[PDB]
């Protein structure tokens, strides 16, 4: 299963996804943590002003390219409530970030959308390693499945 320390940062990601929903946005949150265990950057979706590319994982990738050396990026971890879409997985790989840990997979998300009769996203729900074959990926976290099911249903399952 997932480490206890990893699960604590995933719970922070879920809290960020809840912040996003409560601000009229989509429930996706992500945290960048360095190899010392220091949180460097936290973000959530910001698509409500009209830019559907406003994903936290992408913001993290550009922040890392700006602020961190290649060595430091490679040793950092990105935690996310939901597995990176292909945009974000590719951006992560381009900048040379390290491990990804997700609470819920894109397989879970896509399966729930179809359960609810909801439209699929306009991007295929490709696993990270289809897009970015070298990235170390862990998840999902069983303890957080129900919570994320309920967040996603609130936004996308009406």
Residues that bind ligand BZE (CB under 6 A): 26, 28, 45, 55, 82-83, 85, 106, 109, 121, 123, 125
Cβ burial 89-119 (10 Å sphere, 16+ → b, else e): bbbbbebbbbbbbbbbbbebbeebbeeeebe
Stretch that binds Zn ion, among 41-49, 88-96, 97-105, 128-136 (CB under 5 A): 88-96
Q: Of 71 and 121, which has the nearer Cβ to Zn ion?
A: 121
Which listed residue (12, 44, 55, 73) binds Zn ion by CB under 5 A?
55
β 77-82/29-33 pair status: antiparallel
Interaction of residue 87 with Zn ion, rule CB under 5 A: yes
How many binding residues for Zn ion (CB under 5 A)? Answer: 4
Q: Which residues bind its own copies (CB under 8 A)?
A: 50-53, 58, 61-62, 65-66, 85-87, 89-91, 93-96, 121-124, 126, 130-134
Q: Which residues bind Zn ion (CB under 5 A)?
A: 55, 85, 87-88
């Amino acid at each position: 299963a997932i480490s206890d320390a990893d699960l604590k940062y995933l719970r922070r990601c879920v809290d960020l996804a809840r912040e996003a929903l409560d601000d009229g946005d989509e429930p996706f949150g992500s945290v960048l943590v360095d190899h010392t265990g220091t949180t460097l950057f936290e973000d959530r979706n910001r698509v409500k002003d009209g830019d559907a590319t406003a994903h936290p994982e992408f913001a993290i990738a550009r922040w890392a390219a700006r602020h961190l050396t290649p060595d430091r990026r490679a040793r950092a971890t990105v935690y996310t409530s939901g597995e990176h879409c292909p945009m974000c997985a590719a951006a992560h790989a381009w900048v040379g970030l390290g491990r990804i840990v997700y609470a819920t997979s894109s397989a879970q998300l896509g399966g729930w959308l179809t359960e609810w009769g909801a439209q699929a996203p306009p991007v295929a729900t490709l696993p990270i390693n289809t897009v970015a074959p070298g990235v170390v990926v862990d998840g999902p976290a069983e303890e957080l499945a129900e919570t994320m099911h309920n967040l996603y249903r609130a936004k996308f399952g009406r």
